[PDB]
Amino acid sequence: HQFSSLRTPTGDISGQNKNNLISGKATGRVGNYITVAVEYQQLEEAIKLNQLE
Amino acid sequence: PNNLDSNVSQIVLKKFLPGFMSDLVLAKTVDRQLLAGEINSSTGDSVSFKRP
């Protein structure tokens, strides 16, 4: 919050508006996520895929 | 005259009749040691042998 002051000689502020309390917020939200997919056959890993890791 | 008895039930015994079979001798005689475990994941789908 923020506030403002007044400069008056005798300190009586009759008839003058005071501070207003206003609350604000900051929003955070999730988004799309990252996906990596692969596929392979059976004989492909049986006779053709080595050092898979 | 007619009786038409439906007291009995047509049951099927839990037994299996014998079937037919055949002999496997050609696989035993043909050579199997040269090709045994020669195709793997680091060779592909083909292996070769040299000629005299």
Side-chain angles (χ1 to χ4, degrees), chain A:
Chain A
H1 278 107
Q2 304 222 341
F3 299 96
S4 66
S5 77
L6 287 84
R7 308 305 302 280
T8 68
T10 53
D12 201 73
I13 52 171
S14 305
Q16 284 183 40
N17 56 4
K18 313 165 162 54
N19 289 178
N20 297 115
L21 292 181
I22 297 90
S23 279
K25 76 204 194 82
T27 61
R29 64 182 64 88
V30 305
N32 309 299
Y33 58 110
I34 298 90
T35 46
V36 173
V38 289
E39 65 183 1
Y40 43 92
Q41 306 178 344
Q42 197 189 2
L43 67 94
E44 211 195 348
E45 66 183 1
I47 67 182
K48 262 175 178 166
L49 266 175
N50 53 4
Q51 308 178 302
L52 189 54
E53 69 173 2

mmCIF file of all heavy atoms in Angstrom, chain A:
data_model
loop_
_atom_site.group_PDB
_atom_site.id
_atom_site.type_symbol
_atom_site.label_atom_id
_atom_site.label_comp_id
_atom_site.label_asym_id
_atom_site.label_seq_id
_atom_site.Cartn_x
_atom_site.Cartn_y
_atom_site.Cartn_z
ATOM 1 N N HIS A 1 0.823 -1.199 0.000
ATOM 2 C CA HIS A 1 0.000 0.000 0.000
ATOM 3 C C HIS A 1 0.863 1.258 0.000
ATOM 4 O O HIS A 1 2.043 1.235 0.358
ATOM 5 C CB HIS A 1 -0.931 0.009 1.213
ATOM 6 C CG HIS A 1 -2.169 -0.810 1.029
ATOM 7 N ND1 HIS A 1 -2.358 -2.022 1.655
ATOM 8 C CD2 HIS A 1 -3.282 -0.589 0.293
ATOM 9 C CE1 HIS A 1 -3.534 -2.515 1.309
ATOM 10 N NE2 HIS A 1 -4.115 -1.664 0.484
ATOM 11 N N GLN A 2 0.249 2.368 -0.408
ATOM 12 C CA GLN A 2 0.901 3.668 -0.429
ATOM 13 C C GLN A 2 -0.040 4.706 0.164
ATOM 14 O O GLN A 2 -1.264 4.567 0.106
ATOM 15 C CB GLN A 2 1.306 4.081 -1.851
ATOM 16 C CG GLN A 2 2.202 3.088 -2.564
ATOM 17 C CD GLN A 2 3.319 3.764 -3.330
ATOM 18 O OE1 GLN A 2 3.251 4.956 -3.625
ATOM 19 N NE2 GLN A 2 4.356 3.003 -3.655
ATOM 20 N N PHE A 3 0.545 5.760 0.731
ATOM 21 C CA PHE A 3 -0.220 6.811 1.388
ATOM 22 C C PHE A 3 0.342 8.172 1.000
ATOM 23 O O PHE A 3 1.487 8.295 0.559
ATOM 24 C CB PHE A 3 -0.209 6.644 2.911
ATOM 25 C CG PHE A 3 -0.819 5.359 3.382
ATOM 26 C CD1 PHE A 3 -0.025 4.261 3.661
ATOM 27 C CD2 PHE A 3 -2.189 5.248 3.548
ATOM 28 C CE1 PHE A 3 -0.585 3.079 4.095
ATOM 29 C CE2 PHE A 3 -2.753 4.067 3.981
ATOM 30 C CZ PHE A 3 -1.950 2.982 4.254
ATOM 31 N N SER A 4 -0.485 9.201 1.170
ATOM 32 C CA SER A 4 -0.097 10.575 0.886
ATOM 33 C C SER A 4 -0.398 11.436 2.104
ATOM 34 O O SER A 4 -1.280 11.123 2.906
ATOM 35 C CB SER A 4 -0.822 11.128 -0.346
ATOM 36 O OG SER A 4 -2.215 11.231 -0.110
ATOM 37 N N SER A 5 0.343 12.532 2.233
ATOM 38 C CA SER A 5 0.252 13.404 3.395
ATOM 39 C C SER A 5 -0.374 14.743 3.022
ATOM 40 O O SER A 5 -0.581 15.062 1.848
ATOM 41 C CB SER A 5 1.635 13.620 4.020
ATOM 42 O OG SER A 5 2.392 14.551 3.267
ATOM 43 N N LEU A 6 -0.673 15.531 4.053
ATOM 44 C CA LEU A 6 -1.286 16.841 3.905
ATOM 45 C C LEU A 6 -0.480 17.869 4.682
ATOM 46 O O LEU A 6 0.036 17.575 5.764
ATOM 47 C CB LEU A 6 -2.736 16.842 4.403
ATOM 48 C CG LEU A 6 -3.785 16.136 3.544
ATOM 49 C CD1 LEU A 6 -3.813 14.644 3.829
ATOM 50 C CD2 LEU A 6 -5.152 16.747 3.778
ATOM 51 N N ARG A 7 -0.374 19.075 4.129
ATOM 52 C CA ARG A 7 0.347 20.178 4.759
ATOM 53 C C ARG A 7 -0.645 21.293 5.057
ATOM 54 O O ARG A 7 -1.069 22.014 4.148
ATOM 55 C CB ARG A 7 1.479 20.675 3.865
ATOM 56 C CG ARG A 7 2.419 19.584 3.391
ATOM 57 C CD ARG A 7 2.981 18.798 4.563
ATOM 58 N NE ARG A 7 3.701 19.652 5.499
ATOM 59 C CZ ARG A 7 4.945 20.076 5.322
ATOM 60 N NH1 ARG A 7 5.642 19.742 4.249
ATOM 61 N NH2 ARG A 7 5.503 20.853 6.244
ATOM 62 N N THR A 8 -1.012 21.434 6.327
ATOM 63 C CA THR A 8 -1.969 22.425 6.786
ATOM 64 C C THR A 8 -1.381 23.208 7.951
ATOM 65 O O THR A 8 -0.563 22.678 8.708
ATOM 66 C CB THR A 8 -3.286 21.764 7.224
ATOM 67 O OG1 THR A 8 -3.064 20.996 8.411
ATOM 68 C CG2 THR A 8 -3.823 20.855 6.133
ATOM 69 N N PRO A 9 -1.771 24.474 8.113
ATOM 70 C CA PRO A 9 -1.181 25.293 9.181
ATOM 71 C C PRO A 9 -1.571 24.848 10.583
ATOM 72 O O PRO A 9 -0.700 24.648 11.433
ATOM 73 C CB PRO A 9 -1.712 26.699 8.876
ATOM 74 C CG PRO A 9 -2.956 26.475 8.094
ATOM 75 C CD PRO A 9 -2.707 25.246 7.277
ATOM 76 N N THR A 10 -2.870 24.694 10.838
ATOM 77 C CA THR A 10 -3.354 24.370 12.174
ATOM 78 C C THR A 10 -3.664 22.892 12.367
ATOM 79 O O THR A 10 -3.951 22.481 13.495
ATOM 80 C CB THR A 10 -4.605 25.191 12.499
ATOM 81 O OG1 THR A 10 -5.574 25.019 11.458
ATOM 82 C CG2 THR A 10 -4.255 26.662 12.623
ATOM 83 N N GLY A 11 -3.616 22.088 11.308
ATOM 84 C CA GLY A 11 -3.801 20.660 11.432
ATOM 85 C C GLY A 11 -5.229 20.167 11.372
ATOM 86 O O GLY A 11 -5.455 18.966 11.563
ATOM 87 N N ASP A 12 -6.201 21.037 11.113
ATOM 88 C CA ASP A 12 -7.597 20.631 11.010
ATOM 89 C C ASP A 12 -7.946 20.458 9.537
ATOM 90 O O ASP A 12 -7.841 21.407 8.754
ATOM 91 C CB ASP A 12 -8.521 21.651 11.674
ATOM 92 C CG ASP A 12 -9.870 21.059 12.050
ATOM 93 O OD1 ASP A 12 -9.931 20.280 13.025
ATOM 94 O OD2 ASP A 12 -10.869 21.377 11.371
ATOM 95 N N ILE A 13 -8.370 19.250 9.170
ATOM 96 C CA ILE A 13 -8.553 18.874 7.773
ATOM 97 C C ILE A 13 -10.030 18.687 7.462
ATOM 98 O O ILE A 13 -10.395 17.844 6.635
ATOM 99 C CB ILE A 13 -7.763 17.596 7.442
ATOM 100 C CG1 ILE A 13 -8.101 16.491 8.444
ATOM 101 C CG2 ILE A 13 -6.271 17.877 7.422
ATOM 102 C CD1 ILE A 13 -7.536 15.141 8.079
ATOM 103 N N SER A 14 -10.887 19.456 8.126
ATOM 104 C CA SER A 14 -12.319 19.360 7.878
ATOM 105 C C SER A 14 -12.628 19.653 6.416
ATOM 106 O O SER A 14 -12.107 20.610 5.836
ATOM 107 C CB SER A 14 -13.079 20.330 8.783
ATOM 108 O OG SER A 14 -12.759 20.118 10.147
ATOM 109 N N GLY A 15 -13.474 18.819 5.818
ATOM 110 C CA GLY A 15 -13.899 19.035 4.451
ATOM 111 C C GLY A 15 -12.913 18.618 3.385
ATOM 112 O O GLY A 15 -13.067 19.021 2.229
ATOM 113 N N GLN A 16 -11.903 17.822 3.730
ATOM 114 C CA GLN A 16 -10.910 17.366 2.767
ATOM 115 C C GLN A 16 -10.877 15.846 2.763
ATOM 116 O O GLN A 16 -10.955 15.217 3.823
ATOM 117 C CB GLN A 16 -9.523 17.931 3.086
ATOM 118 C CG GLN A 16 -9.363 19.391 2.700
ATOM 119 C CD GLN A 16 -7.968 19.912 2.955
ATOM 120 O OE1 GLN A 16 -6.981 19.220 2.712
ATOM 121 N NE2 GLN A 16 -7.877 21.140 3.449
ATOM 122 N N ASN A 17 -10.765 15.264 1.571
ATOM 123 C CA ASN A 17 -10.774 13.814 1.436
ATOM 124 C C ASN A 17 -9.503 13.192 2.006
ATOM 125 O O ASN A 17 -8.414 13.766 1.923
ATOM 126 C CB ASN A 17 -10.965 13.423 -0.031
ATOM 127 C CG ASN A 17 -9.915 14.028 -0.951
ATOM 128 O OD1 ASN A 17 -8.979 14.689 -0.504
ATOM 129 N ND2 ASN A 17 -10.074 13.802 -2.249
ATOM 130 N N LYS A 18 -9.657 12.016 2.607
ATOM 131 C CA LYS A 18 -8.549 11.295 3.212
ATOM 132 C C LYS A 18 -8.037 10.227 2.248
ATOM 133 O O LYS A 18 -8.428 10.174 1.079
ATOM 134 C CB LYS A 18 -8.981 10.698 4.549
ATOM 135 C CG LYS A 18 -9.733 11.670 5.439
ATOM 136 C CD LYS A 18 -10.440 10.951 6.571
ATOM 137 C CE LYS A 18 -10.814 11.918 7.679
ATOM 138 N NZ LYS A 18 -11.599 13.068 7.158
ATOM 139 N N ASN A 19 -7.146 9.364 2.729
ATOM 140 C CA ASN A 19 -6.600 8.299 1.903
ATOM 141 C C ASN A 19 -7.639 7.211 1.667
ATOM 142 O O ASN A 19 -8.471 6.927 2.533
ATOM 143 C CB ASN A 19 -5.360 7.690 2.556
ATOM 144 C CG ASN A 19 -4.168 8.620 2.524
ATOM 145 O OD1 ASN A 19 -3.106 8.296 3.048
ATOM 146 N ND2 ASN A 19 -4.338 9.783 1.909
ATOM 147 N N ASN A 20 -7.584 6.606 0.487
ATOM 148 C CA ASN A 20 -8.454 5.495 0.131
ATOM 149 C C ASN A 20 -7.638 4.211 0.097
ATOM 150 O O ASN A 20 -6.527 4.191 -0.441
ATOM 151 C CB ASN A 20 -9.125 5.736 -1.221
ATOM 152 C CG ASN A 20 -10.039 6.939 -1.209
ATOM 153 O OD1 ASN A 20 -9.790 7.928 -1.895
ATOM 154 N ND2 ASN A 20 -11.108 6.861 -0.426
ATOM 155 N N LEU A 21 -8.184 3.147 0.679
ATOM 156 C CA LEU A 21 -7.501 1.861 0.743
ATOM 157 C C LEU A 21 -7.910 1.029 -0.468
ATOM 158 O O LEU A 21 -9.068 0.621 -0.588
ATOM 159 C CB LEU A 21 -7.837 1.144 2.047
ATOM 160 C CG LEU A 21 -7.277 1.784 3.319
ATOM 161 C CD1 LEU A 21 -7.648 0.968 4.542
ATOM 162 C CD2 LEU A 21 -5.771 1.948 3.225
ATOM 163 N N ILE A 22 -6.958 0.779 -1.365
ATOM 164 C CA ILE A 22 -7.180 -0.026 -2.560
ATOM 165 C C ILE A 22 -6.190 -1.181 -2.554
ATOM 166 O O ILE A 22 -4.987 -0.978 -2.356
ATOM 167 C CB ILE A 22 -7.041 0.803 -3.855
ATOM 168 C CG1 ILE A 22 -8.107 1.897 -3.924
ATOM 169 C CG2 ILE A 22 -7.127 -0.089 -5.074
ATOM 170 C CD1 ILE A 22 -7.694 3.197 -3.298
ATOM 171 N N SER A 23 -6.698 -2.390 -2.772
ATOM 172 C CA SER A 23 -5.889 -3.600 -2.748
ATOM 173 C C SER A 23 -5.724 -4.152 -4.157
ATOM 174 O O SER A 23 -6.701 -4.295 -4.897
ATOM 175 C CB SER A 23 -6.521 -4.662 -1.847
ATOM 176 O OG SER A 23 -6.226 -4.412 -0.486
ATOM 177 N N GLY A 24 -4.479 -4.464 -4.518
ATOM 178 C CA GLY A 24 -4.191 -5.062 -5.800
ATOM 179 C C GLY A 24 -3.517 -6.409 -5.622
ATOM 180 O O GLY A 24 -2.974 -6.724 -4.565
ATOM 181 N N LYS A 25 -3.563 -7.205 -6.687
ATOM 182 C CA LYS A 25 -3.030 -8.557 -6.648
ATOM 183 C C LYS A 25 -2.290 -8.861 -7.942
ATOM 184 O O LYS A 25 -2.571 -8.286 -8.995
ATOM 185 C CB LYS A 25 -4.140 -9.588 -6.411
ATOM 186 C CG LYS A 25 -5.005 -9.870 -7.625
ATOM 187 C CD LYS A 25 -6.367 -10.399 -7.213
ATOM 188 C CE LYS A 25 -7.110 -10.998 -8.392
ATOM 189 N NZ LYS A 25 -6.683 -12.394 -8.665
ATOM 190 N N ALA A 26 -1.329 -9.777 -7.843
ATOM 191 C CA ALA A 26 -0.571 -10.268 -8.985
ATOM 192 C C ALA A 26 -0.851 -11.753 -9.149
ATOM 193 O O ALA A 26 -0.720 -12.521 -8.191
ATOM 194 C CB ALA A 26 0.929 -10.024 -8.803
ATOM 195 N N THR A 27 -1.223 -12.157 -10.358
ATOM 196 C CA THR A 27 -1.688 -13.511 -10.624
ATOM 197 C C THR A 27 -0.604 -14.312 -11.330
ATOM 198 O O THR A 27 0.072 -13.798 -12.226
ATOM 199 C CB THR A 27 -2.959 -13.493 -11.475
ATOM 200 O OG1 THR A 27 -2.679 -12.873 -12.736
ATOM 201 C CG2 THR A 27 -4.053 -12.712 -10.775
ATOM 202 N N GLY A 28 -0.440 -15.560 -10.917
ATOM 203 C CA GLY A 28 0.426 -16.504 -11.610
ATOM 204 C C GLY A 28 -0.367 -17.736 -11.996
ATOM 205 O O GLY A 28 -1.229 -18.186 -11.240
ATOM 206 N N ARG A 29 -0.073 -18.276 -13.175
ATOM 207 C CA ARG A 29 -0.832 -19.397 -13.708
ATOM 208 C C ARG A 29 0.093 -20.344 -14.458
ATOM 209 O O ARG A 29 1.162 -19.956 -14.934
ATOM 210 C CB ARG A 29 -1.963 -18.915 -14.626
ATOM 211 C CG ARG A 29 -1.485 -18.194 -15.874
ATOM 212 C CD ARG A 29 -2.659 -17.702 -16.704
ATOM 213 N NE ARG A 29 -3.450 -16.710 -15.986
ATOM 214 C CZ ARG A 29 -3.209 -15.406 -16.000
ATOM 215 N NH1 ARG A 29 -2.206 -14.896 -16.694
ATOM 216 N NH2 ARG A 29 -3.995 -14.594 -15.299
ATOM 217 N N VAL A 30 -0.340 -21.600 -14.558
ATOM 218 C CA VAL A 30 0.420 -22.639 -15.243
ATOM 219 C C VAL A 30 0.180 -22.533 -16.742
ATOM 220 O O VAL A 30 -0.719 -21.813 -17.188
ATOM 221 C CB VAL A 30 0.046 -24.038 -14.726
ATOM 222 C CG1 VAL A 30 0.227 -24.112 -13.222
ATOM 223 C CG2 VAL A 30 -1.381 -24.376 -15.110
ATOM 224 N N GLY A 31 0.981 -23.248 -17.529
ATOM 225 C CA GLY A 31 0.819 -23.237 -18.969
ATOM 226 C C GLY A 31 0.934 -24.611 -19.593
ATOM 227 O O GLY A 31 0.870 -25.623 -18.889
ATOM 228 N N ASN A 32 1.099 -24.661 -20.913
ATOM 229 C CA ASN A 32 1.317 -25.927 -21.589
ATOM 230 C C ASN A 32 2.635 -26.542 -21.126
ATOM 231 O O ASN A 32 3.573 -25.847 -20.730
ATOM 232 C CB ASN A 32 1.329 -25.733 -23.104
ATOM 233 C CG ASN A 32 0.128 -24.966 -23.600
ATOM 234 O OD1 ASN A 32 -1.012 -25.393 -23.427
ATOM 235 N ND2 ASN A 32 0.376 -23.822 -24.222
ATOM 236 N N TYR A 33 2.703 -27.870 -21.178
ATOM 237 C CA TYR A 33 3.858 -28.580 -20.657
ATOM 238 C C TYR A 33 4.551 -29.326 -21.788
ATOM 239 O O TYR A 33 3.983 -29.546 -22.861
ATOM 240 C CB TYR A 33 3.476 -29.520 -19.509
ATOM 241 C CG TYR A 33 2.441 -30.570 -19.822
ATOM 242 C CD1 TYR A 33 2.794 -31.908 -19.896
ATOM 243 C CD2 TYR A 33 1.110 -30.232 -20.011
ATOM 244 C CE1 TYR A 33 1.859 -32.875 -20.165
ATOM 245 C CE2 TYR A 33 0.166 -31.194 -20.282
ATOM 246 C CZ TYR A 33 0.548 -32.513 -20.357
ATOM 247 O OH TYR A 33 -0.385 -33.481 -20.630
ATOM 248 N N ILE A 34 5.791 -29.726 -21.524
ATOM 249 C CA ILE A 34 6.718 -30.210 -22.538
ATOM 250 C C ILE A 34 6.634 -31.726 -22.585
ATOM 251 O O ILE A 34 6.708 -32.391 -21.544
ATOM 252 C CB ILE A 34 8.156 -29.750 -22.242
ATOM 253 C CG1 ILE A 34 8.261 -28.224 -22.270
ATOM 254 C CG2 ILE A 34 9.115 -30.341 -23.242
ATOM 255 C CD1 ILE A 34 8.005 -27.560 -20.935
ATOM 256 N N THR A 35 6.481 -32.275 -23.787
ATOM 257 C CA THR A 35 6.332 -33.712 -23.971
ATOM 258 C C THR A 35 7.286 -34.190 -25.053
ATOM 259 O O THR A 35 7.385 -33.567 -26.113
ATOM 260 C CB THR A 35 4.893 -34.074 -24.352
ATOM 261 O OG1 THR A 35 4.432 -33.177 -25.369
ATOM 262 C CG2 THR A 35 3.980 -33.962 -23.149
ATOM 263 N N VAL A 36 7.985 -35.289 -24.783
ATOM 264 C CA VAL A 36 8.852 -35.945 -25.757
ATOM 265 C C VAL A 36 8.490 -37.422 -25.775
ATOM 266 O O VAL A 36 8.519 -38.084 -24.731
ATOM 267 C CB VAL A 36 10.339 -35.749 -25.426
ATOM 268 C CG1 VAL A 36 11.200 -36.577 -26.364
ATOM 269 C CG2 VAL A 36 10.714 -34.284 -25.525
ATOM 270 N N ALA A 37 8.154 -37.938 -26.955
ATOM 271 C CA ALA A 37 7.720 -39.319 -27.099
ATOM 272 C C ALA A 37 8.436 -39.980 -28.266
ATOM 273 O O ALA A 37 8.756 -39.325 -29.262
ATOM 274 C CB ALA A 37 6.205 -39.404 -27.302
ATOM 275 N N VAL A 38 8.688 -41.283 -28.133
ATOM 276 C CA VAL A 38 9.303 -42.092 -29.175
ATOM 277 C C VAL A 38 8.599 -43.440 -29.221
ATOM 278 O O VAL A 38 7.893 -43.830 -28.289
ATOM 279 C CB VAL A 38 10.816 -42.292 -28.950
ATOM 280 C CG1 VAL A 38 11.568 -40.997 -29.197
ATOM 281 C CG2 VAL A 38 11.076 -42.810 -27.548
ATOM 282 N N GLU A 39 8.799 -44.157 -30.326
ATOM 283 C CA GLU A 39 8.256 -45.501 -30.449
ATOM 284 C C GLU A 39 9.122 -46.314 -31.401
ATOM 285 O O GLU A 39 9.836 -45.763 -32.241
ATOM 286 C CB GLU A 39 6.807 -45.488 -30.939
ATOM 287 C CG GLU A 39 6.627 -44.963 -32.346
ATOM 288 C CD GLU A 39 5.172 -44.912 -32.754
ATOM 289 O OE1 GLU A 39 4.313 -45.268 -31.922
ATOM 290 O OE2 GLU A 39 4.885 -44.520 -33.903
ATOM 291 N N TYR A 40 9.045 -47.637 -31.258
ATOM 292 C CA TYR A 40 9.812 -48.548 -32.092
ATOM 293 C C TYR A 40 9.152 -49.920 -32.074
ATOM 294 O O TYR A 40 8.386 -50.248 -31.166
ATOM 295 C CB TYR A 40 11.273 -48.637 -31.630
ATOM 296 C CG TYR A 40 11.459 -48.739 -30.134
ATOM 297 C CD1 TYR A 40 11.545 -49.973 -29.510
ATOM 298 C CD2 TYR A 40 11.559 -47.600 -29.349
ATOM 299 C CE1 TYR A 40 11.717 -50.067 -28.147
ATOM 300 C CE2 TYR A 40 11.731 -47.687 -27.987
ATOM 301 C CZ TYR A 40 11.810 -48.922 -27.391
ATOM 302 O OH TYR A 40 11.982 -49.014 -26.030
ATOM 303 N N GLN A 41 9.461 -50.719 -33.093
ATOM 304 C CA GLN A 41 8.879 -52.045 -33.231
ATOM 305 C C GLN A 41 9.575 -53.034 -32.300
ATOM 306 O O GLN A 41 10.412 -52.671 -31.470
ATOM 307 C CB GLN A 41 8.963 -52.518 -34.680
ATOM 308 C CG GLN A 41 8.373 -51.556 -35.692
ATOM 309 C CD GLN A 41 8.521 -52.057 -37.115
ATOM 310 O OE1 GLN A 41 9.303 -52.966 -37.387
ATOM 311 N NE2 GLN A 41 7.765 -51.466 -38.032
ATOM 312 N N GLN A 42 9.221 -54.313 -32.437
ATOM 313 C CA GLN A 42 9.817 -55.360 -31.616
ATOM 314 C C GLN A 42 11.075 -55.938 -32.255
ATOM 315 O O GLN A 42 12.131 -55.989 -31.616
ATOM 316 C CB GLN A 42 8.801 -56.473 -31.356
ATOM 317 C CG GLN A 42 9.179 -57.387 -30.203
ATOM 318 C CD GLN A 42 8.280 -58.599 -30.102
ATOM 319 O OE1 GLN A 42 7.383 -58.791 -30.922
ATOM 320 N NE2 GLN A 42 8.512 -59.424 -29.090
ATOM 321 N N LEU A 43 10.987 -56.381 -33.512
ATOM 322 C CA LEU A 43 12.187 -56.847 -34.196
ATOM 323 C C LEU A 43 13.200 -55.722 -34.352
ATOM 324 O O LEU A 43 14.403 -55.980 -34.460
ATOM 325 C CB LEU A 43 11.831 -57.439 -35.561
ATOM 326 C CG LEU A 43 11.289 -56.502 -36.643
ATOM 327 C CD1 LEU A 43 12.399 -55.998 -37.554
ATOM 328 C CD2 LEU A 43 10.219 -57.203 -37.453
ATOM 329 N N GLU A 44 12.728 -54.475 -34.358
ATOM 330 C CA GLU A 44 13.631 -53.336 -34.438
ATOM 331 C C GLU A 44 14.574 -53.295 -33.243
ATOM 332 O O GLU A 44 15.773 -53.044 -33.400
ATOM 333 C CB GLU A 44 12.820 -52.048 -34.546
ATOM 334 C CG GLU A 44 13.489 -50.947 -35.339
ATOM 335 C CD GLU A 44 12.831 -49.607 -35.106
ATOM 336 O OE1 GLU A 44 11.732 -49.586 -34.518
ATOM 337 O OE2 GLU A 44 13.389 -48.578 -35.532
ATOM 338 N N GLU A 45 14.060 -53.539 -32.036
ATOM 339 C CA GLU A 45 14.954 -53.652 -30.892
ATOM 340 C C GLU A 45 15.579 -55.032 -30.772
ATOM 341 O O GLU A 45 16.555 -55.189 -30.033
ATOM 342 C CB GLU A 45 14.229 -53.323 -29.584
ATOM 343 C CG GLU A 45 13.133 -54.296 -29.207
ATOM 344 C CD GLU A 45 12.410 -53.890 -27.940
ATOM 345 O OE1 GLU A 45 12.758 -52.834 -27.372
ATOM 346 O OE2 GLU A 45 11.496 -54.623 -27.511
ATOM 347 N N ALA A 46 15.040 -56.031 -31.468
ATOM 348 C CA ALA A 46 15.600 -57.373 -31.376
ATOM 349 C C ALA A 46 16.878 -57.515 -32.192
ATOM 350 O O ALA A 46 17.810 -58.206 -31.767
ATOM 351 C CB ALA A 46 14.568 -58.407 -31.823
ATOM 352 N N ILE A 47 16.944 -56.883 -33.364
ATOM 353 C CA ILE A 47 18.056 -57.124 -34.280
ATOM 354 C C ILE A 47 18.697 -55.829 -34.765
ATOM 355 O O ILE A 47 19.658 -55.864 -35.541
ATOM 356 C CB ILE A 47 17.605 -57.970 -35.485
ATOM 357 C CG1 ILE A 47 16.630 -57.178 -36.356
ATOM 358 C CG2 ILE A 47 16.991 -59.283 -35.030
ATOM 359 C CD1 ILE A 47 16.090 -57.957 -37.532
ATOM 360 N N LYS A 48 18.186 -54.678 -34.324
ATOM 361 C CA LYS A 48 18.668 -53.416 -34.871
ATOM 362 C C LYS A 48 18.976 -52.340 -33.839
ATOM 363 O O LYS A 48 19.589 -51.332 -34.205
ATOM 364 C CB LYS A 48 17.653 -52.854 -35.878
ATOM 365 C CG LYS A 48 17.974 -53.148 -37.326
ATOM 366 C CD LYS A 48 16.852 -52.671 -38.228
ATOM 367 C CE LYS A 48 17.165 -52.921 -39.690
ATOM 368 N NZ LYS A 48 15.954 -52.767 -40.540
ATOM 369 N N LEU A 49 18.586 -52.503 -32.578
ATOM 370 C CA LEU A 49 18.760 -51.460 -31.570
ATOM 371 C C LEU A 49 19.758 -51.930 -30.522
ATOM 372 O O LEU A 49 19.481 -52.868 -29.766
ATOM 373 C CB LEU A 49 17.427 -51.090 -30.925
ATOM 374 C CG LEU A 49 16.690 -49.904 -31.546
ATOM 375 C CD1 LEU A 49 15.336 -49.716 -30.893
ATOM 376 C CD2 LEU A 49 17.519 -48.642 -31.427
ATOM 377 N N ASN A 50 20.911 -51.269 -30.472
ATOM 378 C CA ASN A 50 21.922 -51.505 -29.454
ATOM 379 C C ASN A 50 22.321 -50.174 -28.836
ATOM 380 O O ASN A 50 22.158 -49.117 -29.450
ATOM 381 C CB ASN A 50 23.149 -52.224 -30.033
ATOM 382 C CG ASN A 50 23.717 -51.523 -31.251
ATOM 383 O OD1 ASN A 50 23.257 -50.450 -31.640
ATOM 384 N ND2 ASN A 50 24.726 -52.130 -31.861
ATOM 385 N N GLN A 51 22.841 -50.234 -27.610
ATOM 386 C CA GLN A 51 23.168 -49.034 -26.838
ATOM 387 C C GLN A 51 21.958 -48.109 -26.734
ATOM 388 O O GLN A 51 22.032 -46.921 -27.052
ATOM 389 C CB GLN A 51 24.367 -48.294 -27.436
ATOM 390 C CG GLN A 51 25.589 -49.159 -27.660
ATOM 391 C CD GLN A 51 26.728 -48.393 -28.295
ATOM 392 O OE1 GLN A 51 26.584 -47.831 -29.379
ATOM 393 N NE2 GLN A 51 27.867 -48.359 -27.618
ATOM 394 N N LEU A 52 20.828 -48.667 -26.296
ATOM 395 C CA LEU A 52 19.587 -47.900 -26.253
ATOM 396 C C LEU A 52 19.666 -46.757 -25.247
ATOM 397 O O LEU A 52 19.148 -45.662 -25.502
ATOM 398 C CB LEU A 52 18.416 -48.824 -25.925
ATOM 399 C CG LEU A 52 17.017 -48.225 -26.053
ATOM 400 C CD1 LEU A 52 16.828 -47.622 -27.431
ATOM 401 C CD2 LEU A 52 15.960 -49.282 -25.785
ATOM 402 N N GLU A 53 20.302 -46.990 -24.095
ATOM 403 C CA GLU A 53 20.367 -45.944 -23.078
ATOM 404 C C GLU A 53 21.155 -44.739 -23.575
ATOM 405 O O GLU A 53 20.777 -43.594 -23.305
ATOM 406 C CB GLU A 53 20.964 -46.484 -21.777
ATOM 407 C CG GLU A 53 22.445 -46.829 -21.827
ATOM 408 C CD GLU A 53 23.007 -47.186 -20.464
ATOM 409 O OE1 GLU A 53 22.235 -47.194 -19.483
ATOM 410 O OE2 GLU A 53 24.224 -47.450 -20.371
#
